[PDB]
Write a protein that binds this DNA or RNA. Structure first.
Length: 196
DNA sequence: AAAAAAAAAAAAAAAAAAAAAAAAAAAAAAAAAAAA
């Protein structure tokens, strides 16, 4: 696993679809068939902290694991680590990469990532701008895409209602960009008039 | 009974510095062009 993680550092390798797909499936088989859900998650966290272009790779790997390899525990642990992660006041690429990863994951698999959203909400208290915007955007996309399945709404009424109430309360903030993200999320929610 | 010498108004240029107008840095949204 280590040599492929080192080779993933350079950007042009990530752009090609075949190699990215092969690395995604090999990482999925490593996580599922051979366990070791601790080294791989730490490597992904290191790559996401030190690099910006690997957020989409992480989200796609998590989506592939959730769909075929039905192992949502890795995503739960990654989200918990993101919630408990601390950033310095000097670096800004780390929070931006985290934000991009959360946005892509919310675009990919709302349902798996919704389970740990209760601990993710605790990250909203951070003074970081991009992370707050990403949390708002992720909440909006999760509640918009989960709207299509009635079973998902029925089974998860309490937390989706809490998330919508928090989004409504987030209409006032020091950052205008967080307010803009909240308004965009509300627009995505109200794009359909069948329910709510 | 002119002639040096000291005291005193009058007057150039010179040095000074923090406060305000103006310009650059950083993150994000919108518009146009290229690749699939």
């Amino acid at each position: 696993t280590r040599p492929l993680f080192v080779l993933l550092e350079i950007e042009p390798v990530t752009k090609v679809s075949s190699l990215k797909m092969f690395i995604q499936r090999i990482l999925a088989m490593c996580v599922k068939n051979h366990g070791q859900s601790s080294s791989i998650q730490s490597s992904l966290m290191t790559n996401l902290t030190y690099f910006l272009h690997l957020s989409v790779f992480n989200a796609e790997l998590l989506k592939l694991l959730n769909d075929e390899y039905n192992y949502p525990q890795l995503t739960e642990d990654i989200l918990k680590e993101i919630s408990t992660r601390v950033f310095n006041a000097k670096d800004t690429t780390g929070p931006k990469a985290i934000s991009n990863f959360l946005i892509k994951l919310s675009e990919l698999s709302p349902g798996i990532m919704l389970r740990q959203m209760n601990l993710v909400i605790t990250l909203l208290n951070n003074s970081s701008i991009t992370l707050r915007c990403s949390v708002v955007e992720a909440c909006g996309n999760i509640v918009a895409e989960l709207a299509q399945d009635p079973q998902t709404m029925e089974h998860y009424k309490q937390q989706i209602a809490v998330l919508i109430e928090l989004l409504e309360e987030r209409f006032q903030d020091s950052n205008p960009y967080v307010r803009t993200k909240a308004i965009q999320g509300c627009s995505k929610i109200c794009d359909l008039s069948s329910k709510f």
